[PDB]
Every structure is written in C-alpha cells, then in structure tokens.
Paper text:
Methylation of cytosine 32 in the anticodon loop of tRNAs to 3-methylcytosine (m3C) is crucial for cellular translation fidelity. Here, we report the cryo-electron microscopy structure of the human m3C tRNA methyltransferase METTL6 in complex with seryl-tRNA synthetase (SerRS) and their common substrate tRNASer. We show that SerRS acts as the tRNASer substrate selection factor for METTL6. We demonstrate that SerRS augments the methylation activity of METTL6 and that direct contacts between METTL6 and SerRS are necessary for efficient tRNASer methylation.
Numbering used by the authors:
A (entry chain D): 2 to 69, 88 to 255, 264 to 475
B (entry chain B): 2 to 74, 88 to 255, 264 to 477
C (entry chain A): 27 to 72, 79 to 271
Amino acid sequence: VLDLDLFRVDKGGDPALIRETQEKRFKDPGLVDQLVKADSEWRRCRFRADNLNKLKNLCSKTIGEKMKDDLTADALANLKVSQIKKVRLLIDEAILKCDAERIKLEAERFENLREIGNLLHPSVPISNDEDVDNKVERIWGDCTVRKKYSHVDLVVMVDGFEGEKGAVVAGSRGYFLKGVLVFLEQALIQYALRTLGSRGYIPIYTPFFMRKEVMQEVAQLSQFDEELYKVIGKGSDEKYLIATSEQPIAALHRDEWLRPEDLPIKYAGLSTCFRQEVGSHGRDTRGIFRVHQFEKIEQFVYSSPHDNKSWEMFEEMITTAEEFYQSLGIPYHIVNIVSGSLNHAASKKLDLEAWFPGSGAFRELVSCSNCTDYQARRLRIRYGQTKKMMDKVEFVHMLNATMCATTRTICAILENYQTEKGITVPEKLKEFMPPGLQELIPFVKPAP
Amino acid sequence: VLDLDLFRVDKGGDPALIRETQEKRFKDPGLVDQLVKADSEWRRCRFRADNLNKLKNLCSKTIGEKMKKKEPVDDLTADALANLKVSQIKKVRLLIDEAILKCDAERIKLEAERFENLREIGNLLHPSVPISNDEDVDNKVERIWGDCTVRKKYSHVDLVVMVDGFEGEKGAVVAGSRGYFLKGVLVFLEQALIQYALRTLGSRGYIPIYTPFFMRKEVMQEVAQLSQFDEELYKVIGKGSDEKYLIATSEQPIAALHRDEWLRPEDLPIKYAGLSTCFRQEVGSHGRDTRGIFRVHQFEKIEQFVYSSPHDNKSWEMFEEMITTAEEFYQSLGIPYHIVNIVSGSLNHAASKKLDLEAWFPGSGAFRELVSCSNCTDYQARRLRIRYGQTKKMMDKVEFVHMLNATMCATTRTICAILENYQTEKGITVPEKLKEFMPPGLQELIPFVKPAPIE
Amino acid sequence: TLVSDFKQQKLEQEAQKNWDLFYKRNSTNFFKDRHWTTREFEELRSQKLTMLEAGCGVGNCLFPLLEEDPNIFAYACDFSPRAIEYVKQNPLYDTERCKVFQCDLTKDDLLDHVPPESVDVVMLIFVLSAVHPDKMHLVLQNIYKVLKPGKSVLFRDYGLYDHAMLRFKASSKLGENFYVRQDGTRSYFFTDDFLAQLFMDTGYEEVVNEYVFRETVNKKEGLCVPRVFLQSKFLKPPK
RNA sequence: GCAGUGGUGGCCGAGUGGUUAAGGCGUCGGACUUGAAAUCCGAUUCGCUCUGCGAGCGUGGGUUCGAAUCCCACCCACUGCGC
RNA sequence: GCAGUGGUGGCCGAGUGGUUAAGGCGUCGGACAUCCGAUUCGCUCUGCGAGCGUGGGUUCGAAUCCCACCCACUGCGC
Ligand SMILES: Nc1ncnc2c1ncn2[C@@H]1O[C@H](CSCC[C@H](N)C(=O)O)[C@@H](O)[C@H]1O
Ligand SMILES: [Mg+2]
Ligand SMILES: [Mg+2]
Ligand SMILES: [Mg+2]
Ligand SMILES: [Mg+2]
Ligand SMILES: [Mg+2]
Ligand SMILES: [Mg+2]
C-alpha cells in the first residue's frame, strides 16, 4: 500500500505522479481520482467524528463532577443532569450516523488503495508485451547449444518420476519423486543453504499455512481466489497454504521497530510452496516443471530505506543468484521485466532465465524483486526504534529473490548435463550426493 | 478389513475366533454377530438379485430373437417365454424391473450396513501381544540400550531457545496455536538428520520417495481409519467445490502407490523410505515438557514402508528387520531407549502387533516415543487390492501382500532428543554421525546464545 | 501346515465334479494314448478275453489294446458323465466289443452292470491315486466280486518320491504323500508296503509289486528328471 | 482455468446396438505320453446357493427389449489457448 | 478437544468506575556521564479523538464489570 500522503496536495504529495505510474503499469489511472475523493471526504468525516466524541466526553465529565451542538464546557455546567442525559442522547444519534458514514468511506478508500501499485524505478522498461520488450541485460554461458532429450523424458529415463500414480493419489499434476531425484533435490537444498549461509543469511523453516488475517497483508486479492489453497480444520480457522516462503518471512517482523544498526537482516527461507495454477503450454512444460507442490529456497532481506542501500542490496541479491547458477554451470540471461507485467508491490524485477538445450527455450528460474516500503507499511515494520515528535515514521525496505526452486532447477540440470549414458553430476553437488551417485546418474529406462 | 469368509461358517470360517480377538482388543463383540446376520441376509439378497437379472437378460434375448426373425407381433423358463408376443414379454419385463429395483435398494442397504460393521473390527492379533487395556502398566519392555536414568539440566523447551533456533510466539501469530519458525542452527540440524536417515535407508536397500502431500478422499478412505479421517485430517479446498486431505504420514500415499495391482512375487519385498511433511491436527499439552517443538501441527518425517510376501513367516522377519533398522539408527546417534510391546487395547484396527522405541529424555526425566513399528498383515492390502501374484489360480482365492510400516525419524522429536542428550554447559555437542552434514563452524558445537527462559 | 481340514472335506465330496470339469475344460486332449500297455503286462498278449477298465477316462487305455487285439470284450467304468460321453462319441467305439457305464467305484457296486466272477482281467492305470486313501479298499472290494477266482488285477500308478510329488508346493499337501492339483483332482503316491497291505486286507494275493524307474527330459530347457511309478499285478486266490 | 480429441482386460490391441470381451504378448500350473517334450494341455476381474448364472470396457448416470458401442456429467491424459 | 486462571504501551510493571495509561528500563535528539525533552495511531496538530489480546455488551462514564473468540499457562482427555 502506498503512503496516503502521496495523494494529498496539502502534504508534500501529488496524485499526478501516481496517475502517470498507473499508466506506466498499464493499469487504470482512474483509481487515483476515486481514491482522492474518498480520502478528502474521509478527512471531513473523521474531523466531525472527533468533535462529536469531544462533546460526549465533556458531557460525561460534567455529569461525573456534578454527581461527586455548540456547547462550551462553561455553558454545559449550568444544567441539571437530566438535561445532560438528553444532550448525550442527541450526541449518540449523531455519532451513530457519522460512524456509519466513516466506515463506508474507509472501506471505499482502502478498496481503491490496495489496487494501486508501487512507484516504478527509472530503469524499468515501459511496455506491456513481455515477449518483445523484456530487456536482456547480460548473457552467461552458451545459450544456443541443443541436446537430445527434454526434461519430460529425462525424469523418466532415470526412473525418478511417477506421474500416473501421483495423479491417482493427488490428482492432476500430482507426482511422486523417487530414487536418484530425491537425492539430487536434497543435494540442491544443501548446496543452496550453505551458499546462502556463508553470505550471512539465516536459514529459516517456515509454517506452511498462515492465518487469513495475516495473509491479507502480504498477498493480493488476485492470489487468494486464483492461487491459494484453503485449509479447513474442525468446526469450520480460515488458514491458507503458503504460495512462497516470502509470505511467512514477511510476517515474521510485523508490527516492530527495528534498530537501524542491525538492518541488513537477511533470511534464507526454506519451505514447501503450493500453487493452484499448473496450466500447460506443450510437452516441454509437463513433468515436474509446473506442479502444485515443490520445495523452494528464498532470499528475503529487510533493508534501510536510506542512501540507495536498498538498490545496492537488490544488485547483491541478483548477483548471489547468478553466482549460484554459474557455479552449477547453467547458462542463462538476466532479463529486466517490463512494467506491464509487474505485481503491485514490485518497483523493479529481474528474472534469471536459464537455457534449456533439450527444450530449446529460456525458462525462468529466479525472480528478484525490490518492493521498497509497499509491504513494510502494511505490516508496520518501522525503521527507527524511536519516533520523533511531529515527524512520521519511516518503514524498512523489503526485497525477495528466489534462490532455487528445486523442481525447475533439477529440470535445468538434467537438460544441461545429459549424456548418452546418463546425466553428469554437476561438480558442485558431488559432495552432497550419496556414494554411487557422485559421477553419473545412469539411464535405466527408455524414453517415452 | 478382514476377509469376509472368516465369518462364513459354511465356508471354512469361524466367527467365534473373531469374537475372542474382539474381546482381547477390548472392543465390542456382538459387532461380529451383527456382521454375521447382515452378511447372511446379503447373500440371499444377492442370490435373488442375480436370478432377477437372469430373467431380465433372458427376456431381452427372446425379444431380440423375435424381432430379428420378424415376428408378426416369476417362474418363467426359456421355452416359456418363447411362446409370447413381444408386447407380453415387455409386460413381464415391467414386473421384473419393479422387483429388481426394490431388491437393489435392499441389497445396497445391506451392503452399507455390513461394511460399516466390518470396518470397526480389528485385525487378528499376533500371539506376542500382551492382552490388556492399561498401557501405563502392562506395556512390555523388551530391550534397553544405553543409560536411561541419567539426568541433565535443561529440557528441550529451554534448549531450543538457548540456541536461538525456535520462534514460537511469532509462529503462533502467523499460523496460530503451535505454529513455529525453525531457524538458524536447528534448520541445519534438521537437514543433517534428513540426509543421514536417507543415506542409511538407501544403503539398506530402501527407495527414497518424496510423496505428494494432498491425498484424494476416495483414496484416503482406503488407507485411513474412521476416527482419523474424521477429526485428525485437515481438508484442502481449491477453486471449485476440494475432496483433498493433507496427509498425516507418508505411509498413506505410499500405501496407495501400488494400489490395485498384481505384484510379482519376485521383487515382492519392496522397501520405500518415504519423505514428506506431516500435518496432524491433534496437539494436546500434558505439561511443560511436551511443548516447544515436541507436539506440533507440521513436521517432517522419514518413514519405512515394506510390501512383503504373505507366506513363510516373511512379514514377521521383515518386522524384526525394520525395528532393528530404527534401533541401529538411534544407536549410531547415541540416544538411549527401550523397546516396548504395546498392549492389545492400544493397537489400532490394522495392526497385529506394534513395537515402539521410547527414547530417554534426560532433561525432562521421561520416556518419549520416537519410533512406531507396526505389522498390519493383509488388512490394508485387501482394502487396496494389492495381490501377491501376477496370475489368479483356477479355484483358489486371491492372496494379498502384507504391508509393514515404521517411523524412521520424526525430525522435531529427534531434534528434541539430541538436544536433551548432548547438552553441555556451553552448548549442544554435535553427534559424530551428523558432522558430515553440518556446515563448517557447526561441526563441533552449537553454542548457547540466549539465557534459559525459565531462569 | 497341511490344507485346511474343511477344504479336504470339500475335495472329497466334490471328487466327481472335479474330474467332470477336468473333461469339460481339457476335452480329450490332455492325456495321450498308452501304447505300452500290451508290452508291459504278460497278460493282454495276443480267446474271448473279457476285460473291465476301472476309471476308463476318455479311452486312452482301452482303445489302443482294443484295436490291437480283436477278440477282447471290454467293460468301461467311470464316475464322470463327460468321460463316458466322450468314449461313446469315439469313432472307434462299437457296442459289440465295449460296454461303458458310469459307476462310482466307492459308492456304487459293479454287479449292477457286470456279471459276478466273469472278468478275467481288470486294469488300474493311474486311477487309484485319484481315490481318497481311506476309500481305496472300498474299490478293491467292489472289484473283488467281479473277478474270476483265478484272474488278476493290473496296476500302475504313482510311486513314492516321484518328481511330480516334489514339484508340488507345500500349500498343495493334504497329508503324508497326499496332494491336490490346481484343478481339484488329487494324487496319492503309493509305496510298495502300503499297496501290498491294502490289497492283502481285501482278499488278494501278491504276484509282482516293484517300482519302475524312468526319466523326463526337455532338451530345449535341458531338463532331465527322475520318475518313479509303481507297477504290480495281484491275483485272486483260486481256492 | 477454457475448447477440441480421447480413455478396453496384467500389457498390446480388435470390437460393427444382439461376443464366447477376438487375436496376440506376459504370468501361472498340470502332464499318466514306450509313437514321451528342443513340448503339449489349460487357466488368468469381481460375485453367488458355482459343470451355470450375475456384474464389469476411466467413474457415475441416461436412451434402448438389449450398450463395451449412442447421450450427459465428472475425473484424468494429449493438442491448442488463458495464466 | 474440555475446565480453571490469565492477556497493559518498544520492554517491564502500577492501575481501584472518573490518570497526564504512574514509575522505571531501552532508544533518539539536545545540553554540556550526568541532566533535559521526546519516544502508539488519527486529525483542519502544542490540542483534540481512538487505543490496555481482538471484537462486542452494561453504564453519564470502562484499562477496571459481563460475554464471545484468539493465544497462553495449570490440570484432564487423546
Ligand atoms: N472312485 C472312482 N470311481 C470311478 N472312476 C474314478 C474314480 N476316481 C477317479 N475315477 C476316474 O479315473 C480317471 C483317472 S484319469 C485315468 C484314466 C485311465 N486310467 C487312462 O489310462 O486313460 C478319471 O477320469 C476319473 O473319472
Ligand atoms: Mg490397456
Ligand atoms: Mg484373450
Ligand atoms: Mg463404466
Ligand atoms: Mg508488555
Ligand atoms: Mg512511561
Ligand atoms: Mg480491547
């Protein structure tokens, strides 16, 4: 959510920038005008409610002192108590009406405000078609070589995938992962966790469901219907399975005043993610590439909002991911996502798209995003530990970046390291593999 | 479920033995008598329904023949119907239809009743089970390993905080009662446990398998119990409605992996090392030392699962082998324990026998169950229709495989045991078998960085 | 251990049904004609020799020796109706040389179809092993009354420790030397002492009773195995 | 998540409104042959009061005297989309 | 899951039907290791309004009394 002072010309804001940003994101620029009218009506309503409450409190104080609507305290003391009770009834009716109006206005304003996106970084490519305007920033490796099989055949040739029985047990896209591919996924988790731990990240295993009252503050409405599973206990709770470990990690510091001294707070989230959308786009998107359930390792950073430090940390996060994939030998290019396909919180996003030689396509493996103070002010995570008198608080900056989604990274490893006799084990995962699987994952079945 | 022919006395059955077993389990006898009468009635109803179906078939065949020979226009016999015009045979077909419909209703009712009586009768008991209903008194201790009387300062409830690896209040804010964040050194320790357990089981010949966490209701009914499926399982709901249930253990999806199959007797001892996150809804606190990460809603578990031959006492040798695998695991981890044989009244319906490994918690002064090894024989395979051979014989009935399961390592509880048993005054000593899988710097000691919450 | 005692009762009461369904599923194609009969026994060699074939099957034991020697009248006994119908529908069948009839050799009596002390030779070729060990002397006595007081009875059947006995899994065992096949028919493996003391208890006299050894070899699977049949001849005392 | 085609027995695969669910392949047992076999004969979803009858062709239903064949829904695949 | 007591501000702690939510301890700033000021949200800001787990009720008036839920702790079930 944006600062409501950005929409108030009275304060040092102006809604013209917000309208031009709503245009850059190719969203509705008309939400800003509705928001401004709702906010300007709400300020009147709130002022009137405070004056009514003031009169009520003065009536109560007069009654209390005597027992032991232009009404001054002096003009009120010269009355009997029954008269004050009549006045209190009048005040109560007025307060009821005003509170109805104010609740309506608050709901309207917050409805128009949760659909306005963060300000954009001047580096974002302004466009709406992703396939042409996404700015490729740097290449690494050989992103043109092509090899025999795609991952959809390779996961079966090594006998590490059970799709039919998984769809019998769990349904569309359900899967069992078995044998050598469980060991490879565990090796990936170990290597990613050690890489991030050496950099100063704190590993954190999160809860897999979250209360709805908390999930609202970290997710959007689009996500709940479209992508979030709902968990039902006994007595019919309202919990949701997490779509990413960024959601619980964000709520780990909600309603806190962080000390500026400890602010580069970096966490390496480890969890299982649950998505509903698994829509397919050909054979090369089947297998374990788009599934409902997968393990993911995340980078989550809380940063100071000052001195451009947030953007330096953004560069550092994407560099950490890049080095992870260079040490694995996966060729990729870094892409600057266009402003049309950004979520509301993101002010800039970089995707790492790996080359798949058996599929002949670039596939997204890492997504790095800087949401600045969009979610910090919704969760009320404040930068300083002390507030100044007559000075609004500053919120921390929050950045998240995927380090390794294990299924997709396994697909990329299989497609990039396939030989005629099996899959070569990447040099950096050999120490985390069992003996017997430290040089080659052998083919044991034919390709379907 | 049990074999229905165990109750038919006209076959080689004997319901008296089922009554004795239902008494030894301290369950309700007379359920056997309700079952026997419902089954004996269902058999007559099935006979009658088959005969009505035969008459309807014969009417349709006669009608077809009359029509294809271009005809000009319930003690029934073949020749009897051959002397009627088509209209009369259709008149008869209407009576057949009415009778068939009422017989079908009666048969469906009898089937449902017999089944709801059958699903509440427990498996036969192994003769080694101690007959009792008092678990605290009659649970037989079989073996003891290590020193199970030593005492140490802190319980796991303090130790998980003194190492700064546990977030309970924020977890309960995020997920609710019992939610938790595991962080820092305890994530590395959990991962080390998973690596060590998977490597051990893989060297023994188990196939590591990562299961789905959502099971469909149609399949979960066949692997779970009434009480569990009622109050113990979370329900998942997507867009639509939603018949999915979060698994309470990896033994449930792995059981449904060879569902409705004819397994070759060669390769019959299939061993699976299941790895998943388990979601249990029942978390009751019996004191302080059961809080922390001991009883939680979500945790990772490594499971043993074996499909075995039903012949030559092979599943019982496999049972001993599985409990031995778990014992050697915890002996290499250096954790003291005793093995207990559970009493008749505490086994669930599928188990013929159950062994438990109960680890000694020196900081709590108690025994806590870490491993649970069960031999459920063919009680579940019959429900899932997992046949023992590939070919059905001419006359003999189909034989089913035996299915055994045993927890290898529940990560939270094993972490609690390791923390309580390896605490020193300066931190937690790392077990020698887990130092391979720990990061550098965490291979000798996990230091205390916070004070004890009790102090 | 052994087969359920309930199941063994079902096998005994369904012996005829099991043999009948055997002839239904296998027709006349399972067993092959026995041309070794005439050579094996010194009888049957080359006047009017009336013969009883107990357990005639679908032929396979009397049609060879009956088209060989043309002055033999034959009685045929079998408790399975299908076997009798197959014997009758055989083109080599003629009533002037054969008299087939159904007769359960344990329950029924032979005098209802053959005249007493008339038959001069009766053959028991792989028939007694299908009878329960406790109802065999019933068959011996049932055929004792139709044998001429100087005639004899010819017997070949399974013997102890034959390979077929060793192929049987343990789930196919009804008792000592007593097994059951997949189709329900049974197999008893005789010993010389058992058969001797079973024939002596019903009024016979032993002449020859000794094992016959062979082998079975399938070259393609390179299987060569030992076989142990027990051949014998018992004679009804003259006076 | 749409808007098309599909789903047969352990597997492959025929199937045409009146099957005996063909043919194979795999598996399993029985073998008594003197003219033994470098093979032959069979069995192979569920149910019942079993030499037979009933049910079953993804799962449920409908139309028809009759469906594995025609219709619908759902589920799961594959091909195109949305995401 | 039920049957007993509980839930105060960044922290801890007083708080009785009428508070400036007291005192401390942090922290920030200023003055020169002490002192002073500030240190939840809102507003048309030097003052008013709201907030004492979260919602409601009773009362002129509730942090205080009642109820529901949530989360704890103490016993039971399991
Ligand atoms: N108790 C009994 N009474 C009459 N026949 C019997 C019998 N027990 C078994 N049989 C018959 O004996 C036959 C054995 S098969 C052998 C048939 C014959 N010996 C031949 O050489 O071809 C079976 O067909 C069975 O029908
Ligand atoms: Mg098929
Ligand atoms: Mg066929
Ligand atoms: Mg159907
Ligand atoms: Mg406090
Ligand atoms: Mg104060
Ligand atoms: Mg309150």
